[model samples]
Target chain A: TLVQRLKLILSGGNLRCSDACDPERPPTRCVFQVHGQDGSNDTFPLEYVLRLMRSWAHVPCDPYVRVQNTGVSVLFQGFFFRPADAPLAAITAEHNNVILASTHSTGMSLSALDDIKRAGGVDTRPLRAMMSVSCFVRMPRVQLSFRFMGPDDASQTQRLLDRAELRQ
Target chain B: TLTRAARDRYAPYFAYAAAQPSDEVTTVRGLSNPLIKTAPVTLPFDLGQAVADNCLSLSGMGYYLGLGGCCPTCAAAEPRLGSDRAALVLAYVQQLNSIYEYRVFLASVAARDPSERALEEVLAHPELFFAYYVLRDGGLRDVRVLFFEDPDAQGALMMYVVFPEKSVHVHHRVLDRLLGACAGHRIVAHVWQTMFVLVVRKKGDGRPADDVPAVSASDIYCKMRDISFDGELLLEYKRLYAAFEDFRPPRP
Candidate 1:
């Protein structure tokens, strides 16, 4: 039930949540949206953020995590990235199950966390918001489909030059 | 447990099912059905293959896995209930592959200095290599494998683990040695993401020609190869991968 109810949009240091305001209550209708310093926004489903959050529980971000080339541990969940930084700091969690539009045309655009930072000096709010949301959805593991939200049309061009798929 | 014993206890209907055709249940020893309530199974067509599948680690086969995916020696020694033994082996392989050990192993391998510790964490449990084959044989095509220098003057051969990616840096010697030890086998690996563990040289120092990561890559994956992929198969691989996820450790 939490699947359809709780969607997260991690954008700003200041928290803005919909549905239940009580921090730890499971959401009946909610989206955790993070606001960027600029007009940009990053949306994540609480389920995935919870998974990624629970994943990066040890190195809670404040400083080091946003540095170029640094990324989350991935912990065997199905996420992928190559070794390059994004050109713009466009951050957003997956707002829907559809392949995102920002990286439209190219199928594998927002493939890694590096693609996000290539777009900010480093938008740490998603990294920051994950801590806040972590308390609410402290689930251990959910067979949820996760996608790195947001994309840069400009960066999609850059991703085209990237390497090929490893195996079928 | 004995293969015949397991057959008698859970699938006594195997012989009958082998003889008759019906999607119905009937009492065969004292039990009403050999196929129900027991862990899931594949009814065998041939008796020897049934014995083989029973005694080998075939997901629901139990102790065969802990005996390292097989045991003709004791016939899947230390036999326990099929469901129970299946759980342990399932947990073993799940945990083995689920960790970001691949990331850590991948990242640290490319760190300015080579990290033996990265690969060591993985190889420390060689049973993982044992788990690799169990799943590979069961038909999981996406997995990782290791290939390294013998240090017997260091250089020779290859292997595969199913890694997914488009491209990878290749090693000259890895291909050269694969035909065999000097020309044969140090060990054999099949159906895995192919990686080469070697001390490497590169263009990083001063040449664009070396376009490979400059650090010594003790384990470098090229790609995973063959696959058509399942669910009870899910039991073992997921079980093995899942056990690896308990970063916190076991509960009392």
Candidate 2:
């Protein structure tokens, strides 16, 4: 209920960026209100959104960003970020809430360029770099953090989210 | 070729081997080189005890254990092999040498045949097939000497030489001094030990700097993490992160 209400407000609200603020800097504040709550909740500042978007830039290849069950949470699959010296250093995040954010220097990868081609995409760069992202939208409270996991667990995090969204 | 200092240091060890009686100086049983001593004469000091003693000089062992390098056809008796840690060090070095030679072969072949035509054609010919497997396996091989300082272990000192097949053997007398020098400087550091130490070292100890190739422990970890994304390797970066996350160095 809170996530739905927050989205409606975010889409309906007009939060303008100031010309004086540096273009590089994401909005530092995100303000929202809860039912019957007297004061506003400013925890989900615009920085989080900017930080998330900035992280997307690090994804090695052109990533397909998709909106998940909650309009707020997003997933960027087929991200390829690997280093030459250590090719095995690619990142693998399946469906789990694991977030290998760009901040982490751990070299990451999705499927190889050839493997991507096999999967109907023509990129077999290296058979690695598969990651997922999620934003928790709950009632009474909202929180955000990252959990990076192997491909196997990434799927589990997704399944649980799917069921929750469907029931909602 | 042995350096002058190395040659000077080896003189006494050679004399000792020479003084041994025919039976005492063991040799290969082969027809052509039957008299060639495969195992060096036993010295008075216990090689194992020297290794156990902290700060023991590795150069001493290195001098006697064929720092000039071992013969490809050499052989040693089982008991002599067990007693001589220096011999073992030489054996390990020789093993690395063999692997290095294989790499040289593969490098030369790949240079001439960029497409690896022989690599594919070898499958049909038994002789070529055998060489192909060696070439294929050779491509995956790697060798590295790693040094680490464990602050928790009373600043205990240790070193190991790694092989590509994920096998590593601890050899104190080989690089103890180099490692000791490494511990003196504060470059950079990371943790990987016990059963998983090899894997930890391989991924975390990034390629040495090109110019000053081998810097310090800190550089090893930083350089490893700094390498940009490339498709040539299939790095298990996520797994490495997990390993570090799960690892809790033994507390004193």
Write down the C-alpha DockQ for each prediction.
Answer: 0.01, 0.00
A-chain TM-score, model 1: 0.19
TM-scores for every predicted model: 0.17, 0.18
Candidate 1, lDDT over the whole model: 0.24
Per-residue error (Å), model 1, residue A39:
38
User: Which residue runs of candidate 1 sit more than 4 Å off their true CA positions?
Assistant: A1-168, B1-127, B138-252
Question: Tens-digit lDDT track for model 2 on B160-212?
Answer: 22233323222322222222222221111122432213211111222221212
Model 1, A1-168: lDDT tens digits are: 111122212222222333212223322222233212211122223323333322222222211111111121111111122123313223333210111112121111222333433332333322111111111110111111122222223233223212111110
Per-model fnat list: 0.00, 0.00
